[PDB]
């Protein structure tokens, strides 16, 4: 597209908002920026040239716009976006903006929880096919500053919020791993207008990869020619269990031995389902997809086994910010002895009920910790201890583990009531496991 003359208002100056910086001055447009933070981190990497306006929005800037460049962080909803599309100002966010100069195939993934791992385990089997894929679209590497004639394939993680900004995708594959009750702010009337968000994705999408377990991923009209399906019991891309082993299996045929894979946790194999579906729609190889499959490690702090050892398996997940993430590590779970479950955070006022049903059975501990510990060991009283911290939590756990046990960290809240950010977290998780577990 031409941006050339215009007057460019580009909302937001995180690292999404700099991209978009970035994209117009690279083709001779500079942009006007604001952002509502008095001193946003990205202020410093600006140029002179753009003019900036910092701690507010600009509404006369908004109202004078040609375009108007909203970052994913602010809503459509809010009364100076309403206001500016009430005029018939056009909004746009940075993935439009990529749509329209895209010149490889984009396999597009949104989804509650799950993006990350999906999105890297499409790039993994590109990588591994020799194909010069761009992966990103997360909030450490906005997808403009993906675009190179160069790549031949573009793998999206996206958000509902950029989503709703978004017209001009035409994804070869696309998916939404799962709808859960979250990002509740910014969707007031509830988990049918976030999954309107999502359900975006799917338009002018050649092959719809959908969760056969979770019917909120379907087409806005329902299954269609185009839908490929993944899912625990069956669909297209389903888990087979017997004998005590388990395969992934595609259209009636066992592909791969878990065994042969790196990954841990029934989710994480429906993760690999989705996104072989995915690479496989978007005319991968399927022998270097399986060969991919072999070699991912799994990103950090996602039901991440960081220490097997004396038969006790110490696993991170504290990405597990929600109840959503945790509820997915628990279902399907499979334990030999006694799961030792840590509970604790900021939960954000969460609805912890659905956790409940997981929680019975004499082979659950909980250990409840941090600002909500207290609501944590209510769902179950009889089997939970509560705890300041999980440092104090794992050394009242650790002399009671035996072979057969697992030890999971899935706390169903945020981290920062006690830690810097959730990877602080899972670190000091990693650190202790090794003190309290190794020998
Ligand atoms: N399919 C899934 N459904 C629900 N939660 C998941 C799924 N896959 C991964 N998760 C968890 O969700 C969080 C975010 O994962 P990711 O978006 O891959 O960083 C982590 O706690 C993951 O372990
Ligand atoms: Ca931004
Ligand atoms: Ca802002
Ligand atoms: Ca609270
Ligand atoms: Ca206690
Ligand atoms: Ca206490
Ligand atoms: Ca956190
Ligand atoms: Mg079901």
Redesign the pocket.
């Known amino acids: 597209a031409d941006y050339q003359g215009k007057n460019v208002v580009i909302i937001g100056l995180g690292l999404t908002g700099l991209s978009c910086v970035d994209f117009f001055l690279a083709r001779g447009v500079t942009p006007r920026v604001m952002d509502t933070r008095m001193t946003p981190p990205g202020l410093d990497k600006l140029p002179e040239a753009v003019e900036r306006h910092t701690g507010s929005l600009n509404d006369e800037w908004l109202m004078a716009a040609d375009l108007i460049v909203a970052s994913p962080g602010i809503a459509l909803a809010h009364p100076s976006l309403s206001a500016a599309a009430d005029a018939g100002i056009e909004i746009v966010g940075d993935i439009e903006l990529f749509c329209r100069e895209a010149q490889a195939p984009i396999v597009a993934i949104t ?10 385990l499409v790039g993994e089997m590109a990588k591994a096919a020799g194909v010069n894929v761009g992966v990103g679209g997360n909030i450490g590497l906005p997808a403009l500053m993906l675009l190179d004639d160069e790549c031949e394939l573009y793998v999206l ?1 996206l958000s509902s919020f950029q989503l709703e900004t978004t017209s001009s995708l035409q994804a070869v594959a696309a998916t939404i ?2 709808v ?1 009750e979250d990002h509740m702010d910014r969707y007031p009337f509830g988990l049918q207008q976030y999954r309107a968000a999502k359900l975006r994705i799917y338009e002018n999408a050649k092959v719809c990869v959908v ?1 056969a377990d979770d019917a909120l991923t379907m087409p806005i009209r329902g299954a269609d020619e185009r839908c490929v399906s993944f899912g625990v019991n069956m669909g297209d891309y389903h888990l087979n269990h017997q004998q005590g082993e388990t395969w992934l299996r595609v259209k009636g045929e066992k592909v791969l031995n878990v065994k042969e894979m790196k990954l841990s ?1 029934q ?2 194999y ?2 690999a389902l ?1 996104a072989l579906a995915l690479a496989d729609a978007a005319g991968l190889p399927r022998a270097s997809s399986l060969k991919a499959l072999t070699t991912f490690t799994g ?1 950090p ?4 086994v960081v220490l097997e050892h004396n038969g006790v398996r110490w696993i991170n ?6 109840v ?6 628990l279902n399907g779970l499979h334990v030999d002895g006694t799961l030792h479950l840590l509970l604790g955070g900021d939960g954000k006022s969460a609805d912890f009920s659905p956790l409940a049903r997981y929680l019975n059975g004499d082979n659950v501990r909980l250990y409840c910790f941090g600002r909500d510990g207290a609501q944590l060991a209510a769902l179950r009283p009889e089997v939970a201890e509560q705890t300041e911290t999980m440092e104090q939590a794992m050394r009242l756990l650790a002399p009671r583990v035996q072979p057969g046990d697992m030890v999971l960290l ?1 706390p169903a809240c945020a981290s920062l009531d006690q830690f810097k950010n959730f990877e602080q977290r899972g670190n000091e998780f990693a650190r202790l496991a090794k003190e309290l577990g190794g020998h």
């Not at 997940?317 to 929600?322: G, I, L, P, Y």
Request: charged share 20%.
């Open positions: 989804g509650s929880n799950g993006k990350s791992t999906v999105t890297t993680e791993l799962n859960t969760n946790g989710h994480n429906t993760n989705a990103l702090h996602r039901f991440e997940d504290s990405k597990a910010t929600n959503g993430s945790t509820e997915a590590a899935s």
